[PDB]
Design a protein around this ligand. Structure first.
Ligand SMILES: O=C(CO)N[C@H]1[C@H]([C@H](O)[C@H](O)CO)O[C@@](O[C@H]2[C@@H](O)[C@@H](CO)O[C@@H](O[C@H]3[C@H](O)[C@@H](O)[C@H](O)O[C@@H]3CO)[C@@H]2O)(C(=O)O)C[C@@H]1O
Lengths: 125, 106
């Protein structure tokens, strides 16, 4: 059974940086991407980016190219997301999600088949 | 960026009903349309990928259809474990974008 255990809720200061983790168990961590997503109160999901643990390659949404940095530790089966220059606009629920098996070579569904429970971040003065 | 619009924003139904919700993409996404369910506690699960393909473990009462810019998710025999918010998401071009969601209530 595939599980993604995310880190606990953090209470961050404006302008500071923070780090959250996504622990993978029950599957080959290097065979699928890990997407990172953002959700605001009673709103839709924003896609931040994904990282390929096999190659450490990262693709990022332009809206987050200076806000988030995605890393993956192959040995510990863990994905990380570093946020910087925090603001109240960053107060949200952050999810990590596993990319489903591809349609064919080079063609991906971009369907996030397994999700972490989410990490709530509160940026407050 | 492809924009996804879901209708209606909220749908109230009863146990056992057959329910269908709509999702419109800004452009032709060539069936790369995925459906997600989100419970009140915050958990998210994939239901349908690639317009009509059922994810592992999802009951066959969930069905999907559509093409081009227009897609739909159908629930027959509504169970109480279906009361949640349902998001569609296109996977045709970077970046992946999600709809505003449809809250399916009793
Ligand atoms: O493309 C990606 C980027 O995340 N991921 C795909 C993975 C990935 O390529 C490999 O897991 C890396 O080792 O592959 C996926 O499909 C694999 C699956 O279909 C499997 C059979 O169940 O076969 C794999 O191919 C192997 C051949 O079967 C072997 O004969 C040959 O020796 O080695 C290849 C290399 O794996 C498929 O790769 C998956 O794991 O689901 C799809 C992912 O999208």
């Amino acid at each position: 059974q595939v599980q993604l255990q995310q880190s606990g809720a953090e209470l961050a200061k404006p302008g500071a940086s923070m780090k959250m983790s996504c622990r993978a168990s029950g599957y080959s961590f290097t065979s699928y991407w890990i997407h990172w997503l953002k959700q605001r109160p009673d709103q839709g999901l924003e896609w931040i980016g994904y990282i390929d643990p096999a190659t450490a390659y990262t693709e990022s949404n332009q809206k987050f190219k200076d806000k988030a940095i995605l890393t993956a530790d192959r040995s510990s089966n863990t994905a990380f997301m570093y946020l910087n220059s925090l603001t109240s606009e960053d107060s949200a629920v952050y999810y990590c999600a596993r990319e489903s098996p591809r349609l064919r070579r080079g063609i991906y569904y971009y369907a996030m088949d397994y999700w972490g429970q989410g990490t709530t971040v509160t940026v407050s003065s």
